[PDB]
Symmetry: C3
């Protein structure tokens, strides 16, 4: 473990996901409302999956060596196996909040799958210039997702209950700001231009992951918007 | 790129998927009806996924070498990663048209997954005779899908709105004719008996893919059947 | 085939899955009730997927060599590709029986995916001590699933129709007893401590798989609980 200088951030990430999982799991024990049970299930599944993948990176399983630039570069592929499942679930948390129609949910989940899959292909691509072509395609998918979150979801949330509108507005702003940082970190880090070394990149991804999963869930699961309107 | 003689068809396929994606994406911008939004989301996701996989084949990522017959044979595995996601979506486009029940949809999607997965296993199998065992299992799954499209779906479509019945009949005939050609091309091409060389096989798959995705979508998204009956 | 002593059990498993698939496929031909069609679709898909993966193990495709303990150990990875799709479907068969809410279904399917995925990671892990860490995480996911089947599902089934309550109670007891045996067999077999040799382990998994899929389906598809209450 300790032979890699990024291990501490991996270890910290593992701890912060596991604790977060346990907290959400304890917080949803006394919940009988089926809407709230949906939100608790999705929101608790997110850091549990992230916990397993951070642990696989810490133990060395989720790492491979990819030759590009004449070098063997360490690529943590397990992130993508994380994100493939946790980014649609997070989007589902937003979409159930505003009661989105099924076609918009399918468009969001499909564009997210394209984003993560093309990011994985770009991370594993051996021709150095082609990695940025895949980065550009994935960033276009992200920009579609952010467009849908701003111009199909806010004006839908304004016509619903005021608590779900305010909670959605906060979670939307958190999501857009945090998700936009990931392609920048990928571009300047070890998967892209190699300006930022791998230990600092691992720290940055850990802060982003913990914020976008545990902090997101802390804002969501403390709101009254997850419960059905009942007496 | 240009070192492989099939590259031109890969390039053409990439172009025709991307253009098709853009056209559907522009055509669904002015759509507010939620049924039509479902059909536009599914139908636009299909050539976008196909675009990414054609690009991966063009850049050389979606190709591997499989030893059989004493030879290293070029196998484009990315097709299967395409088809695993795009063939159920296309089937979903048919199933939402006739308002199929959930069990029939689950049977169709599961049989389709078996078809694509056993095709992938047969494409990667190193023992030459076993490749045709997997081909036979996949063809049996295809024949189940075609049976369901003819004897559980046509007599359901006849009791619905006449526009959805005529549009379903056209798309069903297009789907059956185009999908039946794929196991023949696999059997006589480089994955099977090797009678047709890889560049002609790549051309044939490109014509089939463009027809079964973009032409299918052009027939579907121009019909009144995708809209709810409203004044 | 015959060079491996476990081949006979693989062959027997393949036969028993295929026959079981055919029987369910013939038994659901005369079914028009949409609830019963859902149960027949799920229950027939389970041994069909298991058939394909048993065949891949018999032909040698679903086997890889994993170095641990200074040895190259034969690991049948195809089991996990089986279980990833067939264990949620079986859970779905239970969840549709008691009309479970969507959040509970999502929690069950997600915990099941974590169980199978961490089992696969543990099966492929080259550091011998870490294999049991992944075993422990997967067993914790299994214990969550069994908790939900006993303390969120039985008291829901008691308020429904009596035939669905009795059928659910039988299938729940069968499921809990059979599913609890799998981590024990993994732990003492060739993936874990290596006390039981691979041919006996393959026999044990074949008996468990045939019981938990075909016997489960025989109990389910003979019950009146799968039909809607109609005159
Ligand atoms: C739980 C972690 C989350 C919320 C991860 C979010 C990740 C992204 C929004 C990733 C985006 C990427 C691009 C847009 C292009 C470069 C490749 C990726 C995968 C880093
Ligand atoms: C978008 C492309 C589509 C519609 C692809 C359709 C592909 C099939 C129907 C493939 C079928 C196969 C068999 C039935 C057996 C041989 C292996 C396959 C995968 C080529
Ligand atoms: C169709 C076959 C079925 C029902 C398989 C069930 C498998 C399990 C419940 C597997 C569980 C495992 C653990 C709980 C820990 C050890 C690893 C596994 C994957 C064997």
């Amino acid at each position: 473990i300790t032979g890699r200088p990024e291990w501490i951030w991996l270890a910290l990430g593992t701890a912060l996901m596991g604790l977060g999982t346990l907290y959400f799991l304890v917080k949803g024990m006394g919940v009988s409302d089926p809407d709230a049970k949906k939100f608790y299930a999705i929101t608790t599944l997110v850091p549990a999956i992230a916990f397993t993948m951070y642990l696989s990176m810490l133990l060395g399983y989720g790492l491979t060596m990819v030759p590009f630039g004449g070098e063997q570069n360490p690529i943590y592929w397990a992130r993508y196996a994380d994100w493939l499942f946790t980014t649609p679930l997070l989007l589902l948390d937003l979409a159930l909040l505003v009661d989105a129609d099924q076609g918009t949910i399918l468009a969001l989940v499909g564009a997210d799958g394209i984003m993560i899959g093309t990011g994985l292909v770009g991370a594993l691509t051996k021709v150095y210039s082609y990695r940025f072509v895949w980065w550009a395609i994935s960033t276009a998918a992200m920009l579609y997702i952010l467009y849908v979150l701003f111009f199909g979801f806010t004006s839908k949330a304004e016509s619903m209950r005021p608590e779900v509108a305010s909670t959605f507005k906060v979670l939307r702003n958190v999501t857009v700001v945090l998700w936009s940082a990931y392609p920048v970190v990928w571009l300047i880090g070890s998967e892209g231009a190699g300006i930022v070394p791998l230990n600092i990149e691992t720290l940055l991804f850990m802060v982003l992951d913990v914020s976008a999963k545990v902090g997101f869930g802390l804002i969501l699961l403390r709101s009254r918007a997850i419960f059905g309107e009942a007496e």
